Amino acid sequence: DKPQFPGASAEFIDKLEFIQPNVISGIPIYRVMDRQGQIINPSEDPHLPKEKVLKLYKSMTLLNTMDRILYESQRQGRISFYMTNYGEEGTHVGSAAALDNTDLVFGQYREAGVLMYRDYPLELFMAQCYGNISDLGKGRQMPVHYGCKERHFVTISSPLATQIPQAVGAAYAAKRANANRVVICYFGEGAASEGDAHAGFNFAATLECPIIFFCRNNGYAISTPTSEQYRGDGIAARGPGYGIMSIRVDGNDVFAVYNATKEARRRAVAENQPFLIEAMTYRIGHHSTSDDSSAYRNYWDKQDHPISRLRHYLLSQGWWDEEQEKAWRKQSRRKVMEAFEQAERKPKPNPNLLFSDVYQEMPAQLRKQQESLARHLQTYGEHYPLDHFDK
Amino acid sequence: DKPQFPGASAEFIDKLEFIQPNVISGIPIYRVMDRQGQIINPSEDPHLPKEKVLKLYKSMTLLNTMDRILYESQRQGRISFYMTNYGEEGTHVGSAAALDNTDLVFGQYREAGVLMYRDYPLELFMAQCYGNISDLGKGRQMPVHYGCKERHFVTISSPLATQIPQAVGAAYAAKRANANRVVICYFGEGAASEGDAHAGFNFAATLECPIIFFCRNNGYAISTPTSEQYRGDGIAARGPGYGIMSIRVDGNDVFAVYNATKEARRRAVAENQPFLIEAMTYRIGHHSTSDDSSAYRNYWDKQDHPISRLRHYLLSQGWWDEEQEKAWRKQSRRKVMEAFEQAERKPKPNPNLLFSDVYQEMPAQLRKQQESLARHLQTYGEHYPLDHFDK
Amino acid sequence: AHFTFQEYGQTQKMNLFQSVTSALDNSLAKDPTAVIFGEDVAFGGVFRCTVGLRDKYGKDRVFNTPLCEQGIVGFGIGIAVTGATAIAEIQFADYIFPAFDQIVNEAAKYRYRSGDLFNCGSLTIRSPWGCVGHGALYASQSPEAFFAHCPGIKVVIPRSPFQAKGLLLSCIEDKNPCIFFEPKILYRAAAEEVPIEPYNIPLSQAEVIQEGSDVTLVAWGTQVHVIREVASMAKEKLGVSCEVIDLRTIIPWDVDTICKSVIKTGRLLISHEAPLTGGFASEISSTVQEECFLNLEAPISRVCGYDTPFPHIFEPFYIPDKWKCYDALRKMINY
Amino acid sequence: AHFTFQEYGQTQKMNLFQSVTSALDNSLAKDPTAVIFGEDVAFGGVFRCTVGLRDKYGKDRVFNTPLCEQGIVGFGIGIAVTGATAIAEIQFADYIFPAFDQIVNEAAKYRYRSGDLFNCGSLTIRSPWGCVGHGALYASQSPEAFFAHCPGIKVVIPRSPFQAKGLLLSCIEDKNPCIFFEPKILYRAAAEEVPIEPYNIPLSQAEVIQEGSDVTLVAWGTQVHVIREVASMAKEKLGVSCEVIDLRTIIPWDVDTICKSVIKTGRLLISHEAPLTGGFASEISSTVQEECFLNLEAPISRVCGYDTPFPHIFEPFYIPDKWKCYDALRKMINY
Ligand SMILES: Cc1ncc(C[n+]2csc(CCOP(=O)(O)OP(=O)(O)O)c2C)c(N)n1
Ligand SMILES: Cc1ncc(C[n+]2csc(CCOP(=O)(O)OP(=O)(O)O)c2C)c(N)n1
Ligand SMILES: [K+]
Ligand SMILES: [K+]
Ligand SMILES: [K+]
Ligand SMILES: [K+]
Ligand SMILES: [Mn+2]
Ligand SMILES: [Mn+2]
């Protein structure tokens, strides 16, 4: 006898046996170089040219330099909010480096390194955090909600996981247009608990979309450890359930991250099929500036750091030295401080920008609200911070 | 070197390898008796006493008799809507029989057999479809949205999958009260695509709840085949991803359904752990009375039917015969026609019941709306079907 | 039957569901990027609105999605973000809530928050709407007011086959995410002449379907047919001249047309199937009161569904039928 | 600072977040079934509202859930269905939308649709609410109007630490699913004397905090502090006597108190942070117009946030501050 059910393809079994989840021994973690920067398996070595590996190193450390500066700025109340990328710099640059420049990116908020690798100007990162006249976002969103149409980085929004099924629709449209394009979608392990993640993963598989799902599993969603987030073998183990090709990689190894991403882009585009990459990492800094992470929890910053590990790699190749490290540290700092000071000195956008872009055109009833404000300021203007805004 | 990541428990791997989903050869289908009613493996035989197996048979056929009658009624516009249980009678009685009478049940709309097995009166099934004065639901919901506080069957609602995370909360409260109680939650393979399914499965595992998830996979969600519903190995394969003990059973074999349910209740209650049972079946009749299933698609009704299969089983045991079949068919029909005629003749509830139970108490502004209607009817009453409603 | 139903080249008799199919057909025909998707649209949809479209335009343009509303809208926003036209279907307006977050926090704010670097303007969401005599709680809802409070989206509701096709083609072509509610009770009842080629009806424009001088009656969807009859009752039994207006677009709404009408009549009655508290009639009422205070001769009247869920067997007593609207009109005319 | 803040046994100085903790503490102490859950509540919550509760009552009563709002509400409804008290937390009111379906289609209709065979009355959902000076689009929202259109639920918003604790204890004890919005800007600003033992403040009752005779000013949450100051400005600069009312309960709302006040003053100004179109001020306005038509001396005034998403850098120009309310009051007083 052979099973005839339309919902599944299987054989009958005659004994009652529950399928047990494999958690103690989960999906292994793909690694390319050890914690001392040594390649473990010559056949997995990407052999990236020197210029590209240096670009990886400089993008990571530059991001790091910007994070320190902007984090202090927030502490001083110069900007109202901030979120660093400590410990996850490798997942950003390694995956971005594996993409084509026109692959469309959807993210969460801890992916600024993708933009950095894509040469997003320091002046724009800061324009957005200060909400000044140079922000193409027109100062409307909270700091670190970056976006760039020119570098194919969809504007970041606060609601967790909403970008996931959006990314899938974007990939579906990409498939129809027949471009050699893949869409990549980043999100944390906490965000993976939202209903939208389940929606996106399932639509991606059943609608056959060229998309790479990229989960950064850093062990925490603010104060919640993964033991309270899920009970299966992480995020990677859910991919096959949706019929999605999956893999887990050491998120502190830019080369393992790069190899996995490069291979998933290649197959996703050719086979119009989704791939799931779960990068194991560790959140070094606080969740944000409104969180003191030492309320619910040094090994990961001193003995297993993506920047530190790529550094050892460069040394062994004769590609970097203590002197170059010093010069780059100094130049990084200067570049960041130049952009920072220019950003603080620029005025904020014209208060009228509060009314545009709600709809493409501006509805008549909305223009009347705009005129209302203009009249209000004519009369009570002395009570508003008018001198700081553009006119 | 050993992986130190908090999000997973695994070993490193040195070669890049994507995890491939096993779909061609999925989770096997647990079966206890063949299509001719013969026990396949003596050690899996439940050895249920005769009275209980007959109760199973009579509940299934009785449901079937009620379905035929109510389906015609709908065709004649006597009731406004209806949904039959053809082909899924076995998943209902087999699972209900395995539960304790006080285990709380959450369902979708194709589970009337659970109530039937729980001796829900024919008069009440019909009171609800007619929305007459005997309906404890007070005629407020569409036909077949059954509910019974006394038989622990939570009132059915139309929005798919919402009952899933609800069932989990109910199981969590059950765990705290320390009752020897499990909660069971039924839903179709289509409903399993909603965000709420992902929410319920995950909360159940991480919050350690005594709950049995019961998915009826009948191959279609209205006109959508499973090929367009998911791409993984059905629903069963998603359970382990959430760290949930799972199994697949032949939904047309009441004994396989019963054994799986009995064993899951036993462990769910003792270990405060969720279980996932996916029953493979086939939707024999139309999706509902507003659907003509022969627009998007006889093997399952004549060569693999739960009622037919239990019948052969009874014959081989000397427990049933053609004569008894005839007498039961006649008595079934009579019982159903008696309840049906009493139901059609009862008047509908008092129009005032339209305002109660919105809140426990009735807000003053709501009572004013009630008085408004009462005055309106004083004057324009001749234009409303007042003679059909209770006073 | 709680209601009674009643230039552009060659026309053809079409009921409401057929006029939707005609609009979708014209759109796909003239927009290579346009795709249609949702639960069960491949075989033609549970209300037959997509019959024949998949065979004519291909399975990659007219397809079924998995059963997940938040997914359908998120997926649609994604397609629109690349500039392609996305027409998503939500099977019953009652089931649009699971996608509420994608609609209010995402679609509506997509252009604003990005400084117009990105948008999902080419997105349209169509969904059956309104009572149908026996739909009870989840097959009868009128959720327009929940969306009226959301800056960034448009909500449009037609009253007939001709209006539906023209309003839908504008929604599909508008550069803002749109929600189009189709009165399901009219799908097969309402039948009239409809241009077979494309035409548009503008958004945010109410339509005065009958001029009057004593009172202004405003409604939308099926309810426009109810007040039309109420206007006839008023004339026959009270010698009252009614000005009947179809709002058509919930937001942004045609404030001017309504005010201009009330400035002339001086009396206003607004009617809708949805529950009174928080329904859109409140917005219309408080606004008219602010623009026409000096012209108002009597308090503005709102004849709506009661503040309870939509009932099964009690439907006939729940809806704001012609007798209920007539009575309120009567009392208001006598203020 | 766009605003300035200002019997039951032993009291203690508490800011708003502390008074919430005190209420949750009294509830768990007197209700063995009561549990508290949501994202990050175990270590005390991102606004410190649950500090110490897990250590005092146990991990099975005060625990973290996975990051999924629709799950949190569905889970809560389940607990309530068995009769146990469920206090769910949604981290920011901005993130309540993913649970909209569970709230509107499920929680609100649970008792009605079942004929009272089942209910989820012992469910309470608390969530930070309102602007905070720099929260932009998703850390500033005031979603009360979206819920005002939903028969079956209660929506309650306090203006201070004393009001918060008493209103929350009533929500937790009410036999109807309740949504309690906590003005996050007051969590650490507003500090006053608060009974350490349990007491209740009734739902659906507005509170006249200052008697007046020329105008009635209505608001809720932080905005009550704004109109209090506006009342002071009116007196000092216009010789105008203002009657200041805190609505407290959005639905079912205290219609009587507001009308009685407007019958006396004859003028009304309603103010709220949320966007004007579809905001709750519409419901209040159209209702007053219907009950007090003959007493109204001028059009009812609504001073609200503009019909746009909530902005980051432009916040100061967006909110309906005291100068905006004052000006509208001025013009209305001069009608
Ligand atoms: C729908 C929604 N719910 C809650 C929040 C509040 N929130 C912001 S970040 C966060 C933690 C997310 O954790 P994770 O996805 O693991 O990313 P990580 O910050 O660790 O990179 C939460 C709960 C939100 N922004 N959106
Ligand atoms: C949220 C929601 N979306 C859509 C619907 C419409 N609908 C009713 S039944 C159905 C099919 C569900 O299929 P399945 O879960 O597989 O159950 P089956 O009917 O096959 O037993 C759909 C899409 C609904 N009731 N609720
Ligand atoms: K997002
Ligand atoms: K349900
Ligand atoms: K559009
Ligand atoms: K409550
Ligand atoms: Mn995380
Ligand atoms: Mn099915």
mmCIF file of all heavy atoms in Angstrom, chain A residues 42-62:
data_model
loop_
_atom_site.group_PDB
_atom_site.id
_atom_site.type_symbol
_atom_site.label_atom_id
_atom_site.label_comp_id
_atom_site.label_asym_id
_atom_site.label_seq_id
_atom_site.Cartn_x
_atom_site.Cartn_y
_atom_site.Cartn_z
ATOM 1 N N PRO A 42 42.011 25.142 3.448
ATOM 2 C CA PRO A 42 42.438 25.777 2.198
ATOM 3 C C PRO A 42 41.407 25.758 1.077
ATOM 4 O O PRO A 42 41.324 26.705 0.303
ATOM 5 C CB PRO A 42 43.698 25.003 1.839
ATOM 6 C CG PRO A 42 44.308 24.772 3.175
ATOM 7 C CD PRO A 42 43.112 24.357 4.036
ATOM 8 N N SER A 43 40.617 24.699 0.979
ATOM 9 C CA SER A 43 39.614 24.645 -0.074
ATOM 10 C C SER A 43 38.393 25.577 0.182
ATOM 11 O O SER A 43 37.530 25.743 -0.682
ATOM 12 C CB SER A 43 39.139 23.207 -0.256
ATOM 13 O OG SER A 43 38.199 22.862 0.741
ATOM 14 N N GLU A 44 38.318 26.190 1.360
ATOM 15 C CA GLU A 44 37.206 27.085 1.651
ATOM 16 C C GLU A 44 37.717 28.514 1.626
ATOM 17 O O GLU A 44 36.962 29.463 1.809
ATOM 18 C CB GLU A 44 36.592 26.760 3.025
ATOM 19 C CG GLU A 44 35.992 25.355 3.122
ATOM 20 C CD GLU A 44 34.790 25.156 2.197
ATOM 21 O OE1 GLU A 44 33.940 26.084 2.113
ATOM 22 O OE2 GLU A 44 34.681 24.069 1.560
ATOM 23 N N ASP A 45 39.014 28.674 1.420
ATOM 24 C CA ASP A 45 39.556 30.010 1.371
ATOM 25 C C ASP A 45 39.001 30.733 0.129
ATOM 26 O O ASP A 45 39.135 30.264 -0.988
ATOM 27 C CB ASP A 45 41.075 29.956 1.297
ATOM 28 C CG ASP A 45 41.706 31.322 1.407
ATOM 29 O OD1 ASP A 45 41.125 32.316 0.914
ATOM 30 O OD2 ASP A 45 42.801 31.413 1.981
ATOM 31 N N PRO A 46 38.373 31.895 0.323
ATOM 32 C CA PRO A 46 37.802 32.686 -0.773
ATOM 33 C C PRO A 46 38.893 33.293 -1.689
ATOM 34 O O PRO A 46 38.664 33.548 -2.862
ATOM 35 C CB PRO A 46 37.040 33.800 -0.043
ATOM 36 C CG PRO A 46 36.959 33.330 1.373
ATOM 37 C CD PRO A 46 38.212 32.585 1.606
ATOM 38 N N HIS A 47 40.071 33.546 -1.131
ATOM 39 C CA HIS A 47 41.153 34.164 -1.891
ATOM 40 C C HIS A 47 40.678 35.504 -2.452
ATOM 41 O O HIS A 47 40.711 35.724 -3.660
ATOM 42 C CB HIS A 47 41.601 33.228 -3.024
ATOM 43 C CG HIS A 47 42.295 31.996 -2.527
ATOM 44 N ND1 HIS A 47 42.184 30.771 -3.153
ATOM 45 C CD2 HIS A 47 43.064 31.792 -1.429
ATOM 46 C CE1 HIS A 47 42.849 29.865 -2.453
ATOM 47 N NE2 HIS A 47 43.389 30.457 -1.403
ATOM 48 N N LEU A 48 40.197 36.378 -1.566
ATOM 49 C CA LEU A 48 39.738 37.703 -1.972
ATOM 50 C C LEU A 48 40.992 38.557 -2.175
ATOM 51 O O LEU A 48 41.963 38.452 -1.421
ATOM 52 C CB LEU A 48 38.845 38.335 -0.876
ATOM 53 C CG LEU A 48 37.448 37.712 -0.635
ATOM 54 C CD1 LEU A 48 36.806 38.251 0.660
ATOM 55 C CD2 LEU A 48 36.559 38.005 -1.838
ATOM 56 N N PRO A 49 40.995 39.412 -3.199
ATOM 57 C CA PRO A 49 42.211 40.216 -3.367
ATOM 58 C C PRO A 49 42.424 41.173 -2.188
ATOM 59 O O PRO A 49 41.469 41.570 -1.489
ATOM 60 C CB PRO A 49 41.990 40.895 -4.720
ATOM 61 C CG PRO A 49 40.660 40.396 -5.176
ATOM 62 C CD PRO A 49 40.171 39.470 -4.097
ATOM 63 N N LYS A 50 43.680 41.558 -1.991
ATOM 64 C CA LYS A 50 44.076 42.466 -0.923
ATOM 65 C C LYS A 50 43.225 43.766 -0.776
ATOM 66 O O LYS A 50 42.804 44.136 0.330
ATOM 67 C CB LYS A 50 45.541 42.835 -1.139
ATOM 68 C CG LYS A 50 46.134 43.830 -0.155
ATOM 69 C CD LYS A 50 47.564 44.104 -0.574
ATOM 70 C CE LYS A 50 48.433 44.519 0.585
ATOM 71 N NZ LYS A 50 49.861 44.569 0.128
ATOM 72 N N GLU A 51 43.011 44.468 -1.887
ATOM 73 C CA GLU A 51 42.240 45.707 -1.850
ATOM 74 C C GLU A 51 40.836 45.469 -1.257
ATOM 75 O O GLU A 51 40.348 46.258 -0.450
ATOM 76 C CB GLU A 51 42.119 46.311 -3.264
ATOM 77 C CG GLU A 51 41.352 47.639 -3.303
ATOM 78 C CD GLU A 51 41.076 48.167 -4.729
ATOM 79 O OE1 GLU A 51 40.471 47.425 -5.555
ATOM 80 O OE2 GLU A 51 41.448 49.335 -5.019
ATOM 81 N N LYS A 52 40.197 44.376 -1.649
ATOM 82 C CA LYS A 52 38.877 44.102 -1.132
ATOM 83 C C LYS A 52 38.917 43.717 0.368
ATOM 84 O O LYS A 52 38.062 44.124 1.149
ATOM 85 C CB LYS A 52 38.204 42.999 -1.961
ATOM 86 C CG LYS A 52 36.688 42.972 -1.799
ATOM 87 C CD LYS A 52 36.034 41.942 -2.714
ATOM 88 C CE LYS A 52 34.505 41.930 -2.576
ATOM 89 N NZ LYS A 52 33.888 40.911 -3.477
ATOM 90 N N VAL A 53 39.892 42.936 0.779
ATOM 91 C CA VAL A 53 39.943 42.565 2.175
ATOM 92 C C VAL A 53 40.245 43.802 3.012
ATOM 93 O O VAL A 53 39.722 43.948 4.112
ATOM 94 C CB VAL A 53 40.994 41.499 2.457
ATOM 95 C CG1 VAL A 53 41.063 41.227 3.962
ATOM 96 C CG2 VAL A 53 40.643 40.220 1.732
ATOM 97 N N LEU A 54 41.065 44.712 2.497
ATOM 98 C CA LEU A 54 41.347 45.935 3.257
ATOM 99 C C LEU A 54 40.086 46.807 3.352
ATOM 100 O O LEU A 54 39.841 47.434 4.381
ATOM 101 C CB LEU A 54 42.488 46.732 2.620
ATOM 102 C CG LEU A 54 43.858 46.092 2.810
ATOM 103 C CD1 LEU A 54 44.979 46.923 2.111
ATOM 104 C CD2 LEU A 54 44.124 46.005 4.323
ATOM 105 N N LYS A 55 39.295 46.832 2.278
ATOM 106 C CA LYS A 55 38.058 47.621 2.260
ATOM 107 C C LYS A 55 37.117 47.067 3.344
ATOM 108 O O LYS A 55 36.382 47.830 3.996
ATOM 109 C CB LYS A 55 37.376 47.536 0.889
ATOM 110 C CG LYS A 55 36.077 48.346 0.804
ATOM 111 C CD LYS A 55 35.511 48.331 -0.592
ATOM 112 C CE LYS A 55 34.179 49.068 -0.619
ATOM 113 N NZ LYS A 55 34.301 50.484 -0.116
ATOM 114 N N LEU A 56 37.146 45.744 3.517
ATOM 115 C CA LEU A 56 36.341 45.089 4.535
ATOM 116 C C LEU A 56 36.814 45.564 5.903
ATOM 117 O O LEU A 56 36.006 45.982 6.734
ATOM 118 C CB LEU A 56 36.485 43.565 4.461
ATOM 119 C CG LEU A 56 35.850 42.843 3.255
ATOM 120 C CD1 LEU A 56 36.122 41.347 3.345
ATOM 121 C CD2 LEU A 56 34.346 43.082 3.263
ATOM 122 N N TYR A 57 38.120 45.510 6.126
ATOM 123 C CA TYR A 57 38.671 45.923 7.404
ATOM 124 C C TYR A 57 38.383 47.395 7.705
ATOM 125 O O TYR A 57 37.924 47.737 8.780
ATOM 126 C CB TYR A 57 40.185 45.656 7.456
ATOM 127 C CG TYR A 57 40.782 45.935 8.824
ATOM 128 C CD1 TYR A 57 40.515 45.094 9.912
ATOM 129 C CD2 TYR A 57 41.574 47.060 9.039
ATOM 130 C CE1 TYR A 57 41.025 45.374 11.186
ATOM 131 C CE2 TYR A 57 42.093 47.363 10.294
ATOM 132 C CZ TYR A 57 41.818 46.519 11.371
ATOM 133 O OH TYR A 57 42.342 46.823 12.625
ATOM 134 N N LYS A 58 38.642 48.265 6.748
ATOM 135 C CA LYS A 58 38.412 49.686 6.938
ATOM 136 C C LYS A 58 36.952 50.090 7.106
ATOM 137 O O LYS A 58 36.652 51.098 7.749
ATOM 138 C CB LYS A 58 39.035 50.460 5.775
ATOM 139 C CG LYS A 58 40.552 50.569 5.873
ATOM 140 C CD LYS A 58 41.076 51.232 4.638
ATOM 141 C CE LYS A 58 42.406 51.869 4.891
ATOM 142 N NZ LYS A 58 42.944 52.464 3.623
ATOM 143 N N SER A 59 36.039 49.338 6.505
ATOM 144 C CA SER A 59 34.624 49.657 6.649
ATOM 145 C C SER A 59 34.195 49.297 8.075
ATOM 146 O O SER A 59 33.445 50.046 8.713
ATOM 147 C CB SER A 59 33.786 48.859 5.660
ATOM 148 O OG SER A 59 34.234 49.111 4.357
ATOM 149 N N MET A 60 34.681 48.156 8.568
ATOM 150 C CA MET A 60 34.325 47.717 9.921
ATOM 151 C C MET A 60 34.831 48.684 10.993
ATOM 152 O O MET A 60 34.060 49.149 11.820
ATOM 153 C CB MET A 60 34.878 46.321 10.212
ATOM 154 C CG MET A 60 34.177 45.197 9.473
ATOM 155 S SD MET A 60 34.508 43.603 10.306
ATOM 156 C CE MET A 60 36.094 43.269 9.638
ATOM 157 N N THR A 61 36.133 48.957 10.978
ATOM 158 C CA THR A 61 36.736 49.864 11.943
ATOM 159 C C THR A 61 36.151 51.293 11.791
ATOM 160 O O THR A 61 35.945 51.974 12.788
ATOM 161 C CB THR A 61 38.281 49.917 11.769
ATOM 162 O OG1 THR A 61 38.591 50.322 10.432
ATOM 163 C CG2 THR A 61 38.914 48.549 12.038
ATOM 164 N N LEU A 62 35.885 51.746 10.563
ATOM 165 C CA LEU A 62 35.310 53.075 10.363
ATOM 166 C C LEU A 62 33.914 53.132 11.018
ATOM 167 O O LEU A 62 33.567 54.097 11.689
ATOM 168 C CB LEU A 62 35.181 53.386 8.876
ATOM 169 C CG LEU A 62 34.656 54.808 8.629
ATOM 170 C CD1 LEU A 62 35.618 55.818 9.268
ATOM 171 C CD2 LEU A 62 34.519 55.082 7.150
#
